[PDB]
Design an enzyme around this catalytic site. Structure first.
Site, PDB file in Angstrom:
ATOM      1  N   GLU A  70       0.733  -1.101   0.082  1.00 39.59           N
ATOM      2  CA  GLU A  70       0.003  -0.017   0.060  1.00 39.59           C
ATOM      3  C   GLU A  70       0.861   1.226   0.114  1.00 39.59           C
ATOM      4  O   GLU A  70       2.052   1.219   0.652  1.00 39.59           O
ATOM      5  CB  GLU A  70      -0.922  -0.164   1.262  1.00 39.59           C
ATOM      6  N   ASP A 110      -2.109  -5.296   1.004  1.00 42.00           N
ATOM      7  CA  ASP A 110      -1.592  -4.111   1.404  1.00 42.00           C
ATOM      8  C   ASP A 110       0.181  -4.497   1.916  1.00 42.00           C
ATOM      9  O   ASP A 110       0.667  -3.403   1.797  1.00 42.00           O
ATOM     10  CB  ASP A 110      -2.364  -3.760   2.711  1.00 42.00           C
ATOM     11  N   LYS A 168     -14.995  -8.646   3.337  1.00 36.62           N
ATOM     12  CA  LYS A 168     -13.715  -8.936   2.946  1.00 36.62           C
ATOM     13  C   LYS A 168     -13.258 -10.276   2.422  1.00 36.62           C
ATOM     14  O   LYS A 168     -12.748 -10.734   1.436  1.00 36.62           O
ATOM     15  CB  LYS A 168     -12.598  -8.250   3.695  1.00 36.62           C
TER      16      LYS A 168
HETATM   17  C1  LIG Z   1      10.593  10.155   9.174  1.00 36.72           C
HETATM   18  C2  LIG Z   1       9.249   9.387   9.693  1.00 36.72           C
HETATM   19  C3  LIG Z   1       8.430   8.949   8.388  1.00 36.72           C
HETATM   20  C4  LIG Z   1       8.208   7.462   8.520  1.00 36.72           C
HETATM   21  C5  LIG Z   1       7.369   7.048   7.091  1.00 36.72           C
HETATM   22  C6  LIG Z   1       7.269   5.444   7.134  1.00 36.72           C
HETATM   23  C7  LIG Z   1       6.360   5.139   5.833  1.00 36.72           C
HETATM   24  C8  LIG Z   1       7.108   4.625   4.758  1.00 36.72           C
HETATM   25  C9  LIG Z   1       7.444   5.922   3.625  1.00 36.72           C
HETATM   26  C10 LIG Z   1       7.118   5.880   2.166  1.00 36.72           C
HETATM   27  C11 LIG Z   1       8.603   6.008   1.485  1.00 36.72           C
HETATM   28  C12 LIG Z   1       8.270   7.055   0.391  1.00 36.72           C
HETATM   29  N1  LIG Z   1       8.510   6.556  -0.879  1.00 36.72           N
HETATM   30  C13 LIG Z   1       7.935   6.926  -2.177  1.00 36.72           C
HETATM   31  C14 LIG Z   1       8.006   5.706  -3.084  1.00 36.72           C
HETATM   32  C15 LIG Z   1       9.215   5.099  -2.678  1.00 36.72           C
HETATM   33  C16 LIG Z   1       9.532   5.169  -1.173  1.00 36.72           C
HETATM   34  O1  LIG Z   1       9.802   4.426  -0.533  1.00 36.72           O
HETATM   35  N2  LIG Z   1       6.695   4.476   1.916  1.00 36.72           N
HETATM   36  C17 LIG Z   1       5.296   4.206   1.458  1.00 36.72           C
HETATM   37  C18 LIG Z   1       5.393   2.888   0.486  1.00 36.72           C
HETATM   38  C19 LIG Z   1       6.710   2.130   1.063  1.00 36.72           C
HETATM   39  C20 LIG Z   1       7.448   3.052   1.706  1.00 36.72           C
HETATM   40  O2  LIG Z   1       8.566   2.885   1.812  1.00 36.72           O
HETATM   41  N3  LIG Z   1       8.082   3.919   4.936  1.00 36.72           N
HETATM   42  C21 LIG Z   1       9.828   4.437   4.556  1.00 36.72           C
HETATM   43  C22 LIG Z   1      10.613   3.646   5.286  1.00 36.72           C
HETATM   44  C23 LIG Z   1       9.896   2.131   5.746  1.00 36.72           C
HETATM   45  C24 LIG Z   1       8.420   2.769   5.596  1.00 36.72           C
HETATM   46  O3  LIG Z   1       7.499   2.218   6.222  1.00 36.72           O
HETATM   47  N4  LIG Z   1       6.388   4.960   8.548  1.00 36.72           N
HETATM   48  C25 LIG Z   1       6.698   3.829   8.976  1.00 36.72           C
HETATM   49  C26 LIG Z   1       6.279   4.171  10.289  1.00 36.72           C
HETATM   50  C27 LIG Z   1       5.155   4.862  10.137  1.00 36.72           C
HETATM   51  C28 LIG Z   1       5.380   5.725   9.093  1.00 36.72           C
HETATM   52  O4  LIG Z   1       4.803   6.623   8.910  1.00 36.72           O
HETATM   53  N5  LIG Z   1       9.344   6.415   8.804  1.00 36.72           N
HETATM   54  C29 LIG Z   1      10.623   6.430   7.973  1.00 36.72           C
HETATM   55  C30 LIG Z   1      11.332   5.150   8.480  1.00 36.72           C
HETATM   56  C31 LIG Z   1      10.932   5.049   9.952  1.00 36.72           C
HETATM   57  C32 LIG Z   1       9.910   5.770   9.880  1.00 36.72           C
HETATM   58  O5  LIG Z   1       8.866   5.704  10.933  1.00 36.72           O
HETATM   59  N6  LIG Z   1       8.466   9.908  10.657  1.00 36.72           N
HETATM   60  C33 LIG Z   1       8.156  11.195  10.632  1.00 36.72           C
HETATM   61  C34 LIG Z   1       7.593  11.364  12.193  1.00 36.72           C
HETATM   62  C35 LIG Z   1       6.875  10.221  12.315  1.00 36.72           C
HETATM   63  C36 LIG Z   1       7.680   9.019  11.650  1.00 36.72           C
HETATM   64  O6  LIG Z   1       7.708   8.025  11.803  1.00 36.72           O
HETATM   65  N1  LIG Z   2     -11.476   4.124  -4.206  1.00 32.89           N
HETATM   66  C1  LIG Z   2     -10.346   3.790  -4.195  1.00 32.89           C
HETATM   67  N2  LIG Z   2      -9.666   4.598  -3.440  1.00 32.89           N
HETATM   68  C2  LIG Z   2      -8.093   4.030  -3.119  1.00 32.89           C
HETATM   69  N3  LIG Z   2      -7.664   2.995  -3.601  1.00 32.89           N
HETATM   70  C3  LIG Z   2      -8.528   2.308  -4.415  1.00 32.89           C
HETATM   71  C4  LIG Z   2      -9.591   2.588  -4.462  1.00 32.89           C
HETATM   72  N4  LIG Z   2     -10.496   1.676  -5.384  1.00 32.89           N
HETATM   73  C5  LIG Z   2      -9.394   0.886  -5.615  1.00 32.89           C
HETATM   74  N5  LIG Z   2      -8.194   1.227  -4.868  1.00 32.89           N
HETATM   75  C6  LIG Z   2      -7.122   0.197  -4.765  1.00 32.89           C
HETATM   76  C7  LIG Z   2      -7.177  -1.126  -4.469  1.00 32.89           C
HETATM   77  N6  LIG Z   2      -8.237  -1.235  -3.329  1.00 32.89           N
HETATM   78  C8  LIG Z   2      -7.567  -1.274  -2.228  1.00 32.89           C
HETATM   79  O1  LIG Z   2      -6.305  -1.405  -2.047  1.00 32.89           O
HETATM   80  C9  LIG Z   2      -8.397  -1.402  -0.914  1.00 32.89           C
HETATM   81  N7  LIG Z   2      -9.875  -1.583  -0.926  1.00 32.89           N
HETATM   82  C10 LIG Z   2     -10.652  -1.688   0.055  1.00 32.89           C
HETATM   83  C11 LIG Z   2     -12.143  -1.686  -0.088  1.00 32.89           C
HETATM   84  C12 LIG Z   2     -12.585  -3.266  -0.453  1.00 32.89           C
HETATM   85  C13 LIG Z   2     -13.262  -3.345  -1.574  1.00 32.89           C
HETATM   86  C14 LIG Z   2     -12.855  -2.312  -2.511  1.00 32.89           C
HETATM   87  N8  LIG Z   2     -12.579  -0.969  -1.782  1.00 32.89           N
HETATM   88  C15 LIG Z   2     -12.406   0.414  -1.895  1.00 32.89           C
HETATM   89  O2  LIG Z   2     -13.158   0.889  -2.765  1.00 32.89           O
HETATM   90  O3  LIG Z   2     -11.133   1.019  -1.226  1.00 32.89           O
HETATM   91  C16 LIG Z   2     -11.719   1.594  -0.074  1.00 32.89           C
HETATM   92  C17 LIG Z   2     -10.496   2.129   0.467  1.00 32.89           C
HETATM   93  C18 LIG Z   2     -10.399   3.757   0.981  1.00 32.89           C
HETATM   94  C19 LIG Z   2      -9.430   4.238   1.458  1.00 32.89           C
HETATM   95  C20 LIG Z   2      -8.211   3.429   1.842  1.00 32.89           C
HETATM   96  C21 LIG Z   2      -8.221   2.009   1.515  1.00 32.89           C
HETATM   97  C22 LIG Z   2      -9.191   1.436   0.805  1.00 32.89           C
HETATM   98  N9  LIG Z   2     -10.313  -1.717   1.334  1.00 32.89           N
HETATM   99  C23 LIG Z   2      -8.954  -1.825   1.466  1.00 32.89           C
HETATM  100  O4  LIG Z   2      -8.327  -1.866   2.766  1.00 32.89           O
HETATM  101  C24 LIG Z   2      -7.812  -1.727   0.437  1.00 32.89           C
HETATM  102  O5  LIG Z   2      -6.610  -1.665   0.637  1.00 32.89           O
HETATM  103 MN   LIG Z   3      -6.458  -2.471   2.925  1.00 33.62          MN
HETATM  104 MN   LIG Z   4      -4.847  -1.747  -0.186  1.00 34.70          MN
END
Ligand SMILES: C[C@H](C[C@@H](C[C@H](C[C@@H](C[C@@H](CCN1CCCC1=O)N1CCCC1=O)N1CCCC1=O)N1CCCC1=O)N1CCCC1=O)N1CCCC1=O
Ligand SMILES: Nc1ncnc2c1ncn2CCNC(=O)c1nc([C@@H]2CCCN2C(=O)OCc2ccccc2)[nH]c(=O)c1O
Ligand SMILES: [Mn+2]
Ligand SMILES: [Mn+2]
Length: 179
Positions: free
Chosen positions: A64, A92, A118
């Protein structure tokens, strides 16, 4: 703007808000109009990230938060890596420790009601399911809750904090009815 949008921006951290905007605009929805779904996208995002934070260092592959075609790219790679079945719907997370995709749900009804929706919609059998609610309840496949108690308890507390903040702003009622 709106009161709900203003609350979302001061409640979640900017990185979460930005990913929710991208995910909503990617499916034709505008965060400035569908503000209840904006809150729910931020909530669902933060829960997935707290979830991934609860495991080890390299336990969860976050699905996700990525864009659609890259998210499916990571799914195809996980499937060809381990050999698990390719799910019909985008999950997710993927648990490298247990070797299974995870669907995370955050509901405002009975965890049983949302689980049934679900579990019947997924129909993949291999995908693990884990539902949280805004009242502290959780339900998970095979009663296997993946993470330790302390990590799950933090998520529940966060959900209830979001619920109280909305009610103080008189936003919780329309939010619970919009699902
Ligand atoms: C500083 C810190 C921020 C959190 C952020 C982290 C969520 C997530 C971040 C993004 C990376 C962005 N993109 C863009 C595309 C490629 C890409 O990588 N995504 C989203 C998709 C997967 C991903 O990697 N990441 C990054 C590292 C691991 C992770 O899960 N997390 C995890 C806990 C809750 C939260 O928000 N981080 C960074 C590392 C430790 C941490 O906690 N802060 C600010 C204050 C509070 C806080 O926790
Ligand atoms: N309107 C769309 N907004 C964003 N992402 C969307 C979207 N339609 C499709 N996707 C991406 C693929 N779906 C998901 O990833 C997903 N779906 C669902 C449910 C159940 C059946 C359909 N559904 C749905 O409509 O999303 C709801 C929703 C809303 C906010 C955040 C997460 C989910 N519950 C999940 O927990 C989930 O992770
Ligand atoms: Mn979900
Ligand atoms: Mn999802």
């Amino acid at each position: 703007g709106s009161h709900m949008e203003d609350f979302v921006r001061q409640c979640f951290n900017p990185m979460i808000v930005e990913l929710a905007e991208k995910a909503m605009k990617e499916y034709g929805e505008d965060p400035k109009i569908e503000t209840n779904k904006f809150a729910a996208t931020c909530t669902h995002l933060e829960v997935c990230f707290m979830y991934s934070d609860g495991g080890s260092k390299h336990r969860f592959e976050i699905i996700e938060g990525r864009d659609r075609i890259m998210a499916w790219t990571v799914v195809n790679s996980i499937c060809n890596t381990t050999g698990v079945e390719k799910p019909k719907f985008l999950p997710d997370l993927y648990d490298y420790k247990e070797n299974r995709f995870i669907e995370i749900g955050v509901t405002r009804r009975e965890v049983h009601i949302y689980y049934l929706e679900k579990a019947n919609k997924i129909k993949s059998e291999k995908t693990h399911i884990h539902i949280f609610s805004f009242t502290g309840e959780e339900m998970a496949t095979k009663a296997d809750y993946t993470l330790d108690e302390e990590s799950r308890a933090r998520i529940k507390t966060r959900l209830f904090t979001i619920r109280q903040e909305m009610a103080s702003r008189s936003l919780w009622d329309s939010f619970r009815q919009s699902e």
